[PDB]
């Protein structure tokens, strides 16, 4: 659903064809296009803001779309599957071309630098990788499986050291400087990784 | 996806094989509705059932395209792929483009060193309605299959009398607008399968005054397809022909895709039978 | 001897004159096949049956989605009219001694 | 008690300490064994829902048959009760009163699904692997044995990664890859 | 199948003919094989042997 | 017992099963040293996981690699993949972690195809 903040009202309630759940969302900075993603369908639906029709069903993922986000620079968007592959889309103006970038395990909760040139990922192995967009290669990756504090629940039967509940990161957001990542998951801890020096700065319980 | 796409087939079978055992219960609930409406007598094995009696009190509120095409039928446009066999001759590589032009929403991907698994499996992924693959003998194209992708059926067609469009003259180029269709002489229930498997290769809802019409005619068990444009004069319609002439003949019909090669065979042209030449749609 | 198949029929001009004169009959009459798009109180006792039974169903959906660990398959169709009242739109937000929006809720085009 | 005699019998034609009409055949125990469910009150926590299906089925049977509410409303419901997967087929409208059983809803349990998908060998052994923490749904591992799993979500159960039980499987096919640290 | 027809033209007078075998399988004879003058390809319903003797009924 | 780590390497249809165990510093391919790989121009395409990170880190380990399938070239892309994966999955197991992220950042900046299989799955336009 769209909303106004001047008037507090829906513009239009965008819906799919066959009534799918929607996890996540990505909005064109020039507010023309709203993209959303599922668990049921694994097709990236694309709505226009003016006409409430869906413009296109961008597809090509095995497994669901975790997150979606747009460049603020050139407005390519990049999806984040669970078939271990970032797939970067280019949807504007007679191109309709696709580039997949394979990663090691299931990715979730992407985010893009305000440069519009780098994409930060949070895979299920814990590790956060930083890719380029104009090239498919990666700048570097930073290792997050060790510096995550994990709780033992009350009803558990395993040590807190070797449970695989919480050692990944279900979110990431670049700072607007483009130099730091804050990550947070189903764990007890939040992190502040430096991006060039590739070392965390401080860990928050 | 690969595990999801498999398991929807398994449940579609169990939803289909449930209907065959419930077709008998589908039949008997007609008798209860009519005898409640008009007519006293009621048959013996339907009399002694107390199961079906209590069952009917819910069942009184119940009520055509094929079951594979049922979810999409009018809603989503098809997107189809015309692709060629393996190292094609330059005659048939033209002829795949007339198939690419005869349908709307058709792209031509040249095939070479693809396997039929990784061309199917990299097409269910990208999401297409179906797949058109051709074959040839010495430049004359002979065979043709349409195979609906989300575990849908396939239909291997043999096509005999072809006239490629590039032979004739530089008369121009086709209309490429949404066609009307003409299906003639389809009476058989297997004939209605070939209706509903060919019809969904065209984009839904053509305009009332679009100018090109594609006839699929079935005189003498050879489905004969021609491409026509028409204009309407002060008295009569006057037509002219563009595009290919086919004769065409289906000869086997799997329920899986053309990948599968061990799927259930709905129909299969038996040649070697004492009454093979007698029947029609056999 | 005995054959085994009616062979490939030879396309004479007589066949086509039987065929293109069929097409003129179906164009001019405009009866031809095409894939058409898919489109899209009563009683005082019966309404109270309808009102009880929808209050029970919304209780059921709340229970069934909690079992299913919220992952909810959506309702297929929904069409509804609603009526909005023009208020200065500090009055549509929660009780708090500030505001973000000052104008009326109805747009100037809509009045 | 005693295998009481023949003259003891006729005075005690009705007494029995183990089997009562209140107790209703011990159906609740009899299906707690077949599906191995942990706490006792779990049955009647389902059998309150599975009864509440039929009470909505009944009053929706008391509406007249050519009512576009009623025709819309149970087909609205069979969409949900099939997506959740408690009932096998979507066609019959009288599955909703006859096939909605607790043993139907108690086999979309997680350990039954791990036995249906041939993950664990038996159904007790699947509870043993859930409680020890080897199984997961998508990102997060699941630890309650009694996790209901949607037929849609039934695609996504796997062994939790780097586990000692997903490592042993890959050794059988001689296909480990410790760059995954499987 | 060899030495039933003498020339490649003789086969063309007889194509489409419902050939049968001793073993009882049916078939048809389809095209005159060229590079030897006599033989022809014939599609049966199942795999013919080498030990087997095709016979075409005629009047 | 014996500390080992098994990693795979895959190009066109060629597998590469690289057992890596603590040892003396021999590196075999199909029961033959790595200085005897067939195509003789692409021998430095498999010296890349040796020479990128530095030849000191092979002083304590064994690299037994056996390959099947593929051609002449598409096996050389499999042994350079399974030696890179077999080296960088032994430092996360039996040697230090900070070695591994030094290696995984070394093979990355040179050529990422050493680690993850560049799968050229088709695309329909």
From Swiss-Prot, chain A:
WD repeats lie at residues 17-59, 60-99, 102-141, 164-203. It is found in: Nucleus, Nucleolus. It comes from the Eukaryota. Required for bud-site selection and cell separation. Also involved in nucleolar processing of pre-18S ribosomal RNA. Present with 16700 molecules/cell in log phase SD medium. Belongs to the WD repeat PWP2 family. Interacts with snoRNA U3. Interacts with MPP10. Component of the ribosomal small subunit (SSU) processome composed of at least 40 protein subunits and snoRNA U3. This is Periodic tryptophan protein 2. It comes from Saccharomyces cerevisiae (strain ATCC 204508 / S288c). The gene is PWP2. The chain holds residues 412 to 616 of 923 of the full protein.
UniProtKB/Swiss-Prot annotation, chain B:
The gene is IMP4. This is U3 small nucleolar ribonucleoprotein protein IMP4. Component of a heterotrimeric complex containing IMP3, IMP4 and MPP10. Interacts with MPP10. Component of the ribosomal small subunit (SSU) processome composed of at least 40 protein subunits and snoRNA U3. GO terms for molecular function: RNA folding chaperone; rRNA primary transcript binding; single-stranded telomeric DNA binding; snoRNA binding. It comes from the Eukaryota. InterPro entries: Brix, IMP4/RPF1. It is found in: Nucleus, Nucleolus. Keywords: Nucleus, Ribonucleoprotein, Ribosome biogenesis, rRNA processing. Residues 78-259 form the Brix domain. One of its GO terms (cellular component) is nucleolus. One of its GO terms (biological process) is maturation of SSU-rRNA. Pfam families: Brix (PF04427). Coiled coil: none annotated. Required for the early cleavages at sites A0, A1 and A2 during 18S ribosomal pre-RNA processing.
From Swiss-Prot, chain E:
It is found in: Cytoplasm; Nucleus, Nucleolus. It comes from the Eukaryota. Transmembrane segments: none annotated. Interacts directly with RCL1 and the U3 snoRNA to form a stable subcomplex. Component of the 90S small subunit processome also known as 90S pre-ribosome that consists of the 35S pre-rRNA, early-associating ribosomal proteins most of which are part of the small ribosomal subunit, the U3 snoRNA and associated proteins. GTPase required for synthesis of 40S ribosomal subunits and for processing the 35S pre-rRNA at sites A0, A1, and A2. Controls access of pre-ribosomal RNA intermediates to RCL1 during ribosome biogenesis by binding of RCL1 in a GTP-dependent manner and, via its affinity to U3 snoRNA, delivering it to pre-ribosomes. GTP-binding and/or GTP hydrolysis may induce conformational rearrangements within the BMS1-RCL1 complex allowing the interaction of RCL1 with its RNA substrate. Required for RCL1 import into the nucleus. Belongs to the TRAFAC class translation factor GTPase superfamily. Bms1-like GTPase family. BMS1 subfamily. This is Ribosome biogenesis protein BMS1. It comes from Saccharomyces cerevisiae (strain ATCC 204508 / S288c). The chain holds residues 948 to 1006 of 1183 of the full protein.
Curated annotation (Swiss-Prot), chain F:
Its main location: cytoplasm. Gene3D superfamilies: 3.30.230.10. SUPFAM superfamilies: Ribosomal protein S5 domain 2-like. Pfam families: Ribosomal_S9. The modification Phosphoserine is found at residues 32, 59, 74. GO terms for cellular component: 90S preribosome; cytosol; cytosolic small ribosomal subunit. GO terms for molecular function: RNA binding; structural constituent of ribosome. The modification Phosphothreonine is found at residue 68. It is found in: Cytoplasm. There is a cross-link at residues 28, 45, 57 (Glycyl lysine isopeptide (Lys-Gly) (interchain with G-Cter in ubiquitin)). InterPro entries: Ribosomal_Su5_D2-typ_SF, Ribosomal_uS9, Ribosomal_uS9_CS, Ribsml_uS5_D2-typ_fold_subgr. GO terms for biological process: maturation of SSU-rRNA from tricistronic rRNA transcript (SSU-rRNA, 5.8S rRNA, LSU-rRNA); translational initiation. Component of the ribosome, a large ribonucleoprotein complex responsible for the synthesis of proteins in the cell. The small ribosomal subunit (SSU) binds messenger RNAs (mRNAs) and translates the encoded message by selecting cognate aminoacyl-transfer RNA (tRNA) molecules. The large subunit (LSU) contains the ribosomal catalytic site termed the peptidyl transferase center (PTC), which catalyzes the formation of peptide bonds, thereby polymerizing the amino acids delivered by tRNAs into a polypeptide chain. Present with 33800 molecules/cell in log phase SD medium. There are 2 genes for uS9 in yeast. Belongs to the universal ribosomal protein uS9 family. This is Small ribosomal subunit protein uS9A. It comes from Saccharomyces cerevisiae (strain ATCC 204508 / S288c) (Baker's yeast). The lineage of its organism: Eukaryota, Fungi, Dikarya, Ascomycota, Saccharomycotina.
